[PDB]
Amino acid sequence: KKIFKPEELRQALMPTLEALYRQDPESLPFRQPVDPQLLGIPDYFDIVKSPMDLSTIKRKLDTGQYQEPWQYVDDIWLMFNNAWLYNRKTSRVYKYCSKLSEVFEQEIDPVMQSLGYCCGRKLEFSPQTLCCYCTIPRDATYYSYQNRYHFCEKCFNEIQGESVSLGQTTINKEQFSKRKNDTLDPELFVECTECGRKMHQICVLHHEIIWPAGFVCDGCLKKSARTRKENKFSAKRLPSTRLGTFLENRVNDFLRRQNHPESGEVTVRVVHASDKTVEVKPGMKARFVDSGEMAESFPYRTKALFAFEEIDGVDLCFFGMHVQEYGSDCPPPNQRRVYISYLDSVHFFRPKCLRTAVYHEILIGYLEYVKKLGYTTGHIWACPPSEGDDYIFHCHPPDQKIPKPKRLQEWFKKMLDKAVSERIVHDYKDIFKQATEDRLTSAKELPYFEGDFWPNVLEESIKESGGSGSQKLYATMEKHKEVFFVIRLIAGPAANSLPPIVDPDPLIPCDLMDGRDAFLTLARDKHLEFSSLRRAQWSTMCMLVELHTQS
Ligand SMILES: CCCC(=O)SCCNC(=O)CCNC(=O)[C@H](O)C(C)(C)COP(=O)(O)OP(=O)(O)OC[C@H]1O[C@@H](n2cnc3c(N)ncnc32)[C@H](O)[C@@H]1OP(=O)(O)O
Ligand SMILES: [Cl-]
Ligand SMILES: [Zn+2]
Ligand SMILES: [Zn+2]
Ligand SMILES: [Zn+2]
Ligand SMILES: [Zn+2]
Numbered sequence: 001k002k003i004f005k006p007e008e009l010r011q012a013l014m015p016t017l018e019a020l021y022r023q024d025p026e027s028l029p030f031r032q033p034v035d036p037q038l039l040g041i042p043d044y045f046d047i048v049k050s051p052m053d054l055s056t057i058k059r060k061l062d063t064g065q066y067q068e069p070w071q072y073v074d075d076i077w078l079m080f081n082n083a084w085l086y087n088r089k090t091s092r093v094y095k096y097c098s099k100l101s102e103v104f105e106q107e108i109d110p111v112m113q114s115l116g117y118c119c120g121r122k123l124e125f126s127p128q129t130l131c132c133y134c135t136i137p138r139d140a141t142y143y144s145y146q147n148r149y150h151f152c153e154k155c156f157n158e159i160q161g162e163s164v165s166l167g168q169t170t171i172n173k174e175q176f177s178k179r180k181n182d183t184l185d186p187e188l189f190v191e192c193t194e195c196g197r198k199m200h201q202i203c204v205l206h207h208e209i210i211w212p213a214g215f216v217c218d219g220c221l222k223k224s225a226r227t228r229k230e231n232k233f234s235a236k237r238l239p240s241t242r243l244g245t246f247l248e249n250r251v252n253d254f255l256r257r258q259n260h261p262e263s264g265e266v267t268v269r270v271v272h273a274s275d276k277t278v279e280v281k282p283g284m285k286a287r288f289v290d291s292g293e294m295a296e297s298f299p300y301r302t303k304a305l306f307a308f309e310e311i312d313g314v315d316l317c318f319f320g321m322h323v324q325e326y327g328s329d330c331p332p333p334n335q336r337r338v339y340i341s342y343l344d345s346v347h348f349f350r351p352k353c354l355r356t357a358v359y360h361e362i363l364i365g366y367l368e369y370v371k372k373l374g375y376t377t378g379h380i381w382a383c384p385p386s387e388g389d390d391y392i393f394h395c396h397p398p399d400q401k402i403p404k405p406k407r408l409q410e411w412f413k414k415m416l417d418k419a420v421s422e423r424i425v426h427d428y429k430d431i432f433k434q435a436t437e438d439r440l441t442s443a444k445e446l447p448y449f450e451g452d453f454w455p456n457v458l459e460e461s462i463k464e465s466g467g468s469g470s471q472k473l474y475a476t477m478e479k480h481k482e483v484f485f486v487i488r489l490i491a492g493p494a495a496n497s498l499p500p501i502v503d504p505d506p507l508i509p510c511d512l513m514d515g516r517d518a519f520l521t522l523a524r525d526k527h528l529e530f531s532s533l534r535r536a537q538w539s540t541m542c543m544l545v546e547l548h549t550q551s
Contacts, residue, residue: 006064118203344392394523
């Protein structure tokens with residue numbers, strides 16, 4: 001419907017092209033079509049298969065060859081990427097190109113918005129981290145087979161001879177692709193069904209399941225005084241639980257007491273609950289299970305929960321956590337214990353000044369809740385994610401700093417100190433002090449949680465020592481003590497005569513949220529990043545559809 005008259009486009013876009021032209025000397029290399037012979041570059045057309053330059057763009061613009069402004073934008077970016085492709089990162093033309101692109105980004109965005117568009121930005125997804133069958137860096141050369149087995153240029157030539165082994169089968173090095181990790185997937189567009197304008201799907205938050213009749217831009221809606229049909233796939237409409245309700249009430253009551261300007265309501269939902277078992281690993285099993293001194297496995301309930309806030313009228317998932325709950329039927333040493341498998345956040349909560357406080361309220365609430373059920377003890381491993389890894393949310397904002405261990409430890413201490421002052425937590429200790437207090441003598445007495453540090457270090461210890469599970473145990477606990485919190489919820493004689501633990505909430509099947517892996521995999525496979533407010537809002541919207549529809 002919306003026809004851009006060629007003069008309309010010329011008038012609107014030519015100032016953005018002039019802005020590039022008037023950059024001296026940066027513009028000069030881009031003002032005329034590359035003549036490879038004259039320029040003393042014969043191999044230019046071996047690399048650059050779609051040449052483009054300012055004159056060609058000016059001409060297409062003057063002669064009405066563009067039907068819509070994104071076609072202009074694509075040519076501009078083709079020109080830039082042609083130069084970034086052919087020239088070295090350290091070269092003259094490369095840096096000139098970079099300068100022009102910065103001028104262009106600043107010029108183009110408000111123009112595109114004047115023409116009725118979401119924005120004028122060129123948007124691409126973050127590059128995935130490539131492992132090594134070690135990790136491969138952005139833009140640096142690497143070797144791959146079936147887009148499945150990749151090797152960094154160093155550890156590839158490390159391999160002696162001409163044959164690699166995958167799995168087992170043997171592959172000649174000549175069968176590997178040599179390539180640079182410089183591939184970035186563009187963001188997708190959706191077309192307004194009325195005016196025909198192409199908009200970033202993430203800018204407009206159009207999801208085909210939620211609005212199956214098709215996308216209609218805000219411009220077109222406002223002209224006829226319409227509004228979008230309600231999004232029924234919201235965080236609020238996910239099923240309530242006793243736990244979720246309790247946590248969200250605690251949070252919102254806290255926010256209401258603070259009365260900070262521009263506070264929003266928080267929604268907390270439990271989205272997974274299932275019964276699982278942790279199996280004792282082979283070292284510890286040979287040592288204690290086979291002689292009947294320790295259970296071969298421990299049953300627990302896993303739960304996944306998320307907190308959401310409305311930001312700019314749209315749901316935003318900002319906090320996530322998975323927990324392991326070992327009930328009263330579980331064998332010692334795990335009986336009546338909870339362990340935090342992992343928690344994660346995306347730092348867009350508003351207001352900023354209460355973000356940490358809100359995370360603390362969620363954790364204190366959770367401790368309070370399980371205490372009420374009759375869980376006696378909480379367990380926290382203060383372990384930051386490894387470099388460029390994510391616990392729950394794929395692709396964090398690059399400006400969200402990741403705490404190192406000391407900061408993270410102090411953060412848990414501040415939470416627990418508040419919990420103590422509220423008389424929820426009786427006390428807490430590091431693992432070494434706790435073991436001392438419990439007169440622990442053997443490794444079989446240490447709580448054994450899925451994915452935790454202690455099961456792994458005990459395997460290593462038994463093997464290193466040639467059969468002892470407990471020789472250096474106090475020394476290992478002392479050495480790592482600052483990182484391991486044991487939290488006493490129910491203290492002393494009362495902890496010995498408790499009734500059975502009965503959880504009033506039902507099980508909640510949801511394979512997507514059975515541990516962290518499935519949601520990380522989904523997010524990676526569908527470009528669901530949490531790396532900016534807009535991408536997190538999209539990713540939240542998609543997550544919520546998935547949670548509503550898989551149920
Ligand atoms: C077995 C695992 C069990 C667990 O899951 S233990 C927790 C492991 N999970 C993670 O670390 C997930 C990634 N981290 C997060 O989502 C968050 O950092 C977390 C843990 C929820 C806490 O968030 P926040 O309450 O916002 O506290 P914070 O320490 O992250 O940030 C508060 C202020 O400290 C700053 N900060 C954090 N790391 C820093 C650094 N490395 N260098 C310098 N500054 C740093 C941060 O920028 C912030 O400053 P500001 O007050 O906003 O100016
Ligand atoms: Cl999607
Ligand atoms: Zn946009
Ligand atoms: Zn490598
Ligand atoms: Zn429209
Ligand atoms: Zn404030």
